[PDB]
Amino acid sequence: STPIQQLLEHFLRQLQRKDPHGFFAFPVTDAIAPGYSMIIKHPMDFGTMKDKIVANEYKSVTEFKADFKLMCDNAMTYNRPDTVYYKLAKKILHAGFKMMSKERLLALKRSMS
Numbered sequence: 001s002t003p004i005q006q007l008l009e010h011f012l013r014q015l016q017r018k019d020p021h022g023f024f025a026f027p028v029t030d031a032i033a034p035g036y037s038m039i040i041k042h043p044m045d046f047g048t049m050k051d052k053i054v055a056n057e058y059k060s061v062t063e064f065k066a067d068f069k070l071m072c073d074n075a076m077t078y079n080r081p082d083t084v085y086y087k088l089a090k091k092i093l094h095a096g097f098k099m100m101s102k103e104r105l106l107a108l109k110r111s112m113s
């Protein structure tokens with residue numbers, strides 16, 4: 001794997017630690033979540049992201065972070081705010097936005113000098 005793949009794997013591992021029950025580990029099915037495919041146009045989950053890293057499909061942290069954002073946004077769209085899934089998505093979203101912030105990335109870049 002390349003350094004960018006390893007960095008994204010790092011971020012993904014840290015984010016998945018925030019989902020110990022594995023609700024974001026694989027695609028949400030309509031059996032699990034009635035009507036989901038009628039509401040959510042562009043599904044995403046951590047497993048799909050892992051596959052995209054392995055398939056070398058992300059060129060940048062920006063592209064990875066967009067998939068991560070989509071995953072949380074989907075959960076916060078389908079599910080109401082009082083639900084397990086909405087609250088967990090929000091928790092993960094905030095963790096990821098901090099982890100992959102411009103300031104965090106600048107700190108990493110400084111150390112790569």
Ligand SMILES: COc1ccc(Br)cc1-c1nc(N)nc2[nH]cnc12
Pocket residue numbers: 022023024025026027028029032033075078079085
């Ligand atoms: C794969 O998802 C699940 C797995 C097991 C169980 Br029980 C629930 C979900 C799930 N349910 C809903 N309503 N919204 C989600 N957003 C992300 N996960 C989910």
Ligand SMILES: [Br-]
Pocket residue numbers: 082083084085
């Ligand atoms: Br719930």
